[PDB]
Paper text:
Here we use the evolution of a new essential subunit in the protein complex of the CO2-fixing enzyme [name] to understand the genetic and structural mechanisms that have maintained this interactions’ essentiality for over 2 billion years of evolution. Modern-day Form I [name] assemble into a complex of eight catalytic large subunits (LSUs) and eight non-catalytic, accessory small subunits (SSUs, L8S8 complex). Even though more ancestral forms of [name] exist and are functional without the SSU, all known Form I [name] are strictly dependent on a SSU for solubility and activity. In prior work, we used ancestral sequence reconstruction to resurrect ancestral [name] that existed before and after the SSU first appeared (named AncL and AncLS, respectively).
The three substitutions (R269W, E271R, and L273N, abbreviated as REL) are localized in proximity to [name]’s dimer-dimer interface. Indeed, instead of forming an octamer, the AncL+7-based triple mutant AncL+7 REL was dimeric in the absence of AncSSU, as determined by mass photometry (MP). Even a single substitution (E271R) was sufficient to abolish octamer formation and led to ~60% reduced activity under assay conditions, whereas activity in presence of AncSSU was unchanged. We did, however, observe that the addition of known active site inhibitors of [name], namely xylulose-1,5-bisphosphate (XuBP) or 2-carboxyarabinitol-bisphosphate (CABP), induced octamer formation in AncL+7 REL. A strong enough active site binder or very high concentrations of the protein can thus force AncL+7 REL into octamers, even though its native substrate RuBP cannot. This implied that there is a direct link between [name] active site and the dimer-dimer interface and suggested that Form I [name] need to be octameric to be fully catalytically active. In addition, we also noticed that AncL+7 REL (as well as all other constructs that form dimers instead of octamers without AncSSU) were drastically destabilized towards thermal denaturation (~30 °C), which was partially recovered by AncSSU addition. This implies that LSUs in dimers are less stable than LSUs associated into octamers.
Author numbering:
A (entry chain A): 6 to 453
B (entry chain B): 6 to 454
The structure:
Amino acid sequence: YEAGVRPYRETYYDPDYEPKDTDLLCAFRITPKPGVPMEEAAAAVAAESSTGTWTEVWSNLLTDLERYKARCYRIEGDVAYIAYPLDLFEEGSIVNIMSSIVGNVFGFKAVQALRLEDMRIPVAYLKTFPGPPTGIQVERDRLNKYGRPLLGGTIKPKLGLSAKEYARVVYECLRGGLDTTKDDENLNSQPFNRWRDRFLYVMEAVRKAEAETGERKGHWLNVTAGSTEEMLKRAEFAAELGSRYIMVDFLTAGFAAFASVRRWARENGLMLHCHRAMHAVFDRQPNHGIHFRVLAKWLRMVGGDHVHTGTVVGKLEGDRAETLGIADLLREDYVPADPGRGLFFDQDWAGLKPVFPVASGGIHVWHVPDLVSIFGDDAFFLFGGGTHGHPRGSRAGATANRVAVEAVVQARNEGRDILAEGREILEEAARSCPELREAMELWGDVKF
Amino acid sequence: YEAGVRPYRETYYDPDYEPKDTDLLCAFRITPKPGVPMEEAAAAVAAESSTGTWTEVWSNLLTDLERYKARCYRIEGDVAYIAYPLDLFEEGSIVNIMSSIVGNVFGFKAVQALRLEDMRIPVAYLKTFPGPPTGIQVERDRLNKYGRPLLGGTIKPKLGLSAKEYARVVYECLRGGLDTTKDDENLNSQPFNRWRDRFLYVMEAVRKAEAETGERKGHWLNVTAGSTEEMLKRAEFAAELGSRYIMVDFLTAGFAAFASVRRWARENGLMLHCHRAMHAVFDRQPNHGIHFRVLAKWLRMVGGDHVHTGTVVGKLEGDRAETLGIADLLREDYVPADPGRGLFFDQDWAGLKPVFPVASGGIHVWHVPDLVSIFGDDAFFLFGGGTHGHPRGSRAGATANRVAVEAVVQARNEGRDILAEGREILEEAARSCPELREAMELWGDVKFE
Ligand SMILES: O=C(O)[C@@](O)(COP(=O)(O)O)[C@H](O)[C@H](O)COP(=O)(O)O
Ligand SMILES: O=C(O)[C@@](O)(COP(=O)(O)O)[C@H](O)[C@H](O)COP(=O)(O)O
Ligand SMILES: [Mg+2]
Ligand SMILES: [Mg+2]
């Protein structure tokens, strides 16, 4: 034992280290404090997210730190690659992953900015997670909906509607052609719209639209609440009412409570829509935070049946190439690394079920060719304002959106160039769909 | 009903609005996309965090939007003030506050960066929250410790120690003078150290150190786990073993599970240490995120008995003036606005109990004058590496740290200027304490900016 401060890089930078298949790997984009070399900043991150602290401690000799320490094993420009032994992590706990990987290292004086870009979850650790409770293919079977994107939409105004008027809007949307509708992420239980009232009114409207259309419907009833116990109480009521779905804001509720609801959802046979509210607080800026592709991996591990991925073309920010990579991470059995999409690692998904991407936010009929081109069939497209903002209201808007999606799907199946002919495809459909004609006219001037 | 897209500012910018005492107020620092005026960007934030969306909807006429909409009511440079009616929020739910205020508005194309600086929680909403399960004054009575900062320290190395060796370090620290010790935030249950074993070994060491010193001791047993059910299972065992404390990483576990643990702690009579792991992921940068003072307010509302606040002088970033304001938000009954410290609003705490600030991270004996100057008596100072890194180990390090704090507190109560006379106060104590002498000698040239 030699007391005293040593540079972090002495113990935690090891560019000769060869990662094991069981290691968890991180790619961090590092902005060192001016004067601090990349090697020392990267080693600081490795040390303070695994075993080390700021000075040598006598108790380091009471264990084999060579067995347990994280190691920065590669630095490419400002990207540091760090390997973490499998033994460092609690089985089945995303919460533990976060507590190590993003716990303290984003606040060090020596590292002025830090962004977690990607993470390689090893198969041996992935096997301790349950994954989605339903999965894309089982969900399609429960809905009896194949060969096309699924249609949804958030009820608007976000807040302020009574339970009765809220369910009226739900009914009009489902009756007009949407497969699903959803509570806004911030609609939980409030004086103007209490959750028990909303759940009862809405399921009546869902049943009525299902009977009248002859198609299966769902509403994503938001069980997000102030405590885990309260969330599970709201889920139980949704199950009692025969809802196919519940919805959780998995980041604002938090991963521990999210895990509790996932367990409940699987055991009670309901599908779990996951809203990513708060994600942009820390995934927006390229110099600091956690890229969404990491959150998407953690989501698939805990188990959501859908998660929002962005639209690329709508009102909220989202890079096209990054979104294509995120879609693959959610849906495929194995995703090879791709620097063009910010996928720093190969990701084997170890047989876990796939997750539906959900494209929502500021989209309307003119975006449908782009969205089908981006996502293919296995996605939800959500039209909130793009449904209720139709000149003739929600039911007509739902018809316009549903017809537009089916027209573009048909064109793709016929081998047409759905981007090169997108407007022509929509105009053909509009000739026998007045609602689509009226939607195209209203929003023809609205781009982001 | 007029269909089509309107500017957000038409409905959601109201510079003549006078906030009500029941309103929830937010101060956002807004960086608009180039070409987007501040009024439109601020109105977009107000709209998309309350009632609006990107195009006019027929259902807007099915309610009274004027009664429920949020309104940007003042702009000062790049800071927009937004008022939210009380009816918009679910009683007792921080989760609901976040889902509205920070739910989607940080990801809009029209607003390239956004930072929530402060939030005025109105009294009528605050009354629906329970606050800390113990509180500073009740906690001091439970510990029978008065008139000084309390001493703690994280066990090191962070991970890798067996339960037996882990508790050996705990015992040496508590025996040497620390009031408490704690699990690292990332020590939960792992192959080298399972939580049931750790809880048993550690509580034996706590009881042994309490019997040999004659002073009450505690260890912050981390119950942070993958699910709410598992966290409550670990808390139960901590209570069965007679621990005074449990610990939760309230942000990585999340606020819904945090509230579940707070309720458990109050009902089972255990004190709740709250670690802010992950906070810097979104409170570090000045252009985008949520300032920690907002997280501190939410923490006191749900109810933690301590929360980390930073050290200012240690290894992790923290601004001195902002930290002074955060300490006041955690401890005082009422906190007036203070632009010089980033407190944009008066905050009435409506009778809620206060929270212990906790200063931890890279600090050693030379930082003690600054730490007592910044925080006063009602705080914990934690020395992890600053204890176990002593030339003669944890027991000697704990004595050095305890002696330094009591000397600086002594000199302060002696009318001395502990900042100007800091080096001399420590050296006077170093003459009668060789442990302190060796600590000061070892870390003399270890400085953080
Ligand atoms: O609150 C909203 O804005 C929405 O209901 C969209 O409403 P519109 O359909 O009326 O735009 C969705 O929650 C966002 O799209 C979520 O963003 P993301 O999908 O990027 O998480
Ligand atoms: O993991 C660590 O670094 C610590 O155990 C400090 O160890 P040392 O005492 O050896 O530095 C604490 O968790 C940090 O202080 C937390 O940061 P904050 O208090 O700013 O949340
Ligand atoms: Mg929404
Ligand atoms: Mg720690």
